[PDB]
Scaffold this active site. Structure first.
Site, mmCIF file in Angstrom:
data_model
loop_
_atom_site.group_PDB
_atom_site.id
_atom_site.type_symbol
_atom_site.label_atom_id
_atom_site.label_comp_id
_atom_site.label_asym_id
_atom_site.label_seq_id
_atom_site.Cartn_x
_atom_site.Cartn_y
_atom_site.Cartn_z
ATOM 1 N N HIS A 101 -24.697 -1.324 -26.716
ATOM 2 C CA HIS A 101 -25.325 -1.137 -28.015
ATOM 3 C C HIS A 101 -26.777 -0.705 -27.864
ATOM 4 O O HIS A 101 -27.246 0.179 -28.567
ATOM 5 C CB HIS A 101 -25.235 -2.439 -28.792
ATOM 6 C CG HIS A 101 -23.844 -2.892 -29.068
ATOM 7 N ND1 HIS A 101 -23.429 -4.195 -28.890
ATOM 8 C CD2 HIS A 101 -22.786 -2.221 -29.518
ATOM 9 C CE1 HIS A 101 -22.164 -4.305 -29.247
ATOM 10 N NE2 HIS A 101 -21.765 -3.118 -29.670
ATOM 11 N N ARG B 76 -16.161 5.301 -28.110
ATOM 12 C CA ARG B 76 -15.770 4.825 -26.790
ATOM 13 C C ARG B 76 -14.382 5.342 -26.416
ATOM 14 O O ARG B 76 -14.202 5.892 -25.330
ATOM 15 C CB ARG B 76 -15.752 3.291 -26.775
ATOM 16 C CG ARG B 76 -15.520 2.680 -25.397
ATOM 17 C CD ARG B 76 -15.187 1.188 -25.439
ATOM 18 N NE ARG B 76 -16.360 0.354 -25.726
ATOM 19 C CZ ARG B 76 -16.544 -0.455 -26.767
ATOM 20 N NH1 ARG B 76 -15.571 -0.668 -27.644
ATOM 21 N NH2 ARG B 76 -17.727 -1.043 -26.928
ATOM 22 N N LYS C 84 -13.058 -11.077 -38.758
ATOM 23 C CA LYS C 84 -12.847 -12.023 -37.670
ATOM 24 C C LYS C 84 -14.119 -12.859 -37.477
ATOM 25 O O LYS C 84 -15.210 -12.310 -37.275
ATOM 26 C CB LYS C 84 -12.456 -11.283 -36.382
ATOM 27 C CG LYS C 84 -11.791 -12.183 -35.366
ATOM 28 C CD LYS C 84 -11.529 -11.594 -33.981
ATOM 29 C CE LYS C 84 -10.972 -12.645 -33.046
ATOM 30 N NZ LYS C 84 -10.903 -12.200 -31.651
ATOM 31 N N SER D 5 -18.402 -6.374 -26.726
ATOM 32 C CA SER D 5 -18.770 -7.745 -27.000
ATOM 33 C C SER D 5 -17.597 -8.676 -26.667
ATOM 34 O O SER D 5 -17.755 -9.602 -25.876
ATOM 35 C CB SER D 5 -19.201 -7.907 -28.438
ATOM 36 O OG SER D 5 -20.500 -7.368 -28.662
#
Lengths: 173, 159
Positions: A32, A105, A56, A143
Site C-alpha cells: 500500500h 494485483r 468482513k 493484508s
C-alpha cells in the site's frame, strides 16, 4: 478570463489533481505504501481513504487503522489519511477529488475493477479511475496473508513498516 | 512540478478509444506524447508518416499533446523526452498480463518511469484498430469508431 468562463476539465490542458486511494488497510502494508508513494509523486494531493465499516470484520478498528497509516505515511507531505463510511464516489465528491487510485494485483480482479470503474463513471463522471501495478517486491503480499502468516509466527518484518509490525504482534497475543 | 507522460502504441490507425484515453491523460498530466512505434514487428496498414499525420490531426485540439514516432527502447525514448510517466490503455485481461510483464521490465530499465493504466470508456471497450480494420475490409460501418480524417483515409486504403 474569469468574467467569461470558469473553465472545463477536458481539452484545455492540465488541471490540479486530487486523488483518493480507498481500501480497508487492515493493516496498511509496504505494498500500500508503495502504491500511495507512486501516486503522490504524480498527483498534487492524495487521500488514503480507510473504509470504516467493511463487510468482513477487521482485525484493527478504524481508529487504529487510521493511526497506523498516518504514522506510516507522515514522510509524504502531499498525503492525508482519513476514514470514510460511504461509496468511494460519494467520498470523492465530498473531498472534491477528481482521481481514484486502484491497485491492480491479479488478473482475476481485472474484470471486477473494470466493472467498478464503469459504475463510478456513472455515479461521478468527473472522477477518473487510475490503475497502478504493485512493485514486484510486494506483488504477492496482502493484508490478509500477512496476518495469517503472523498468526502462526511466520516472519513478516519485511512486508510491514515497524509501527504496524509492533501493533500486529500485540494483536496476536 | 512537471508531469510528462508518453502514451505508446502502433496506432494503426488511431481510434476513438485511443482518443478517449489520451484526452483523459492530458487532463491529469502537464504534457502527453502520443509515441507511435516506427517499426512494429507486424507490418502496419498505415506507415509511420501516415499514422503520425492522422493522429496529429485527430489530437490537434488538445493543446498539451504532441504526436511523435519512435524507433528505440521505450525507456531510452522516455529518457530522451524527459518523460516520467508511461500511459497504457487496458482493454482486455489478456493484455493486462503482458503489460504487467513489460512494466516490470521498464521498472528495471528506468526506475524513475512510472507506468499508469487507464480503462477504456464503456463506449469504446470492445473496439481495437485490428477489429475496426477487419470490419471495414468487409464493408461494415465503422463511422462511429473513428474520427472523420481517419475514416476517410481507411476507406481510401481499402479501395
Amino acid at each position: 478570463m474569469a468574467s467569461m468562463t470558469g473553465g472545463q476539465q477536458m481539452g484545455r490542458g492540465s488541471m490540479s489533481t486530487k486523488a483518493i486511494y480507498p481500501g480497508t488497510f487492515d493493516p496498511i502494508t509496504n505494498g500500500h505504501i508503495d502504491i500511495i508513494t507512486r501516486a503522490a509523486s504524480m498527483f498534487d494531493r492524495v487521500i488514503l481513504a480507510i473504509a470504516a465499516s467493511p463487510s468482513k470484520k477487521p482485525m484493527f478498528d478504524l481508529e487504529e487503522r487510521v493511526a497506523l497509516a498516518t504514522t506510516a505515511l507522515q514522510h509524504l507531505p502531499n498525503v492525508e489519511v482519513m476514514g470514510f463510511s460511504d461509496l468511494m464516489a460519494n467520498f470523492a465528491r465530498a473531498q472534491q477529488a477528481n482521481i481514484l487510485i486502484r491497485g491492480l494485483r491479479a488478473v482475476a480482479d481485472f474484470e471486477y475493477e473494470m466493472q467498478l470503474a464503469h459504475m463510478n463513471r456513472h455515479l461521478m463522471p468527473e472522477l477518473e479511475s487510475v490503475f497502478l501495478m504493485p512493485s514486484k517486491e510486494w506483488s504477492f503480499i496482502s493484508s490478509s496473508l500477512v496476518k495469517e502468516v503472523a498468526r502462526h509466527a511466520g516472519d513478516v518484518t519485511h512486508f510491514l513498516p515497524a509501527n504496524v509490525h509492533q501493533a500486529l504482534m500485540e494483536k496476536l497475543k
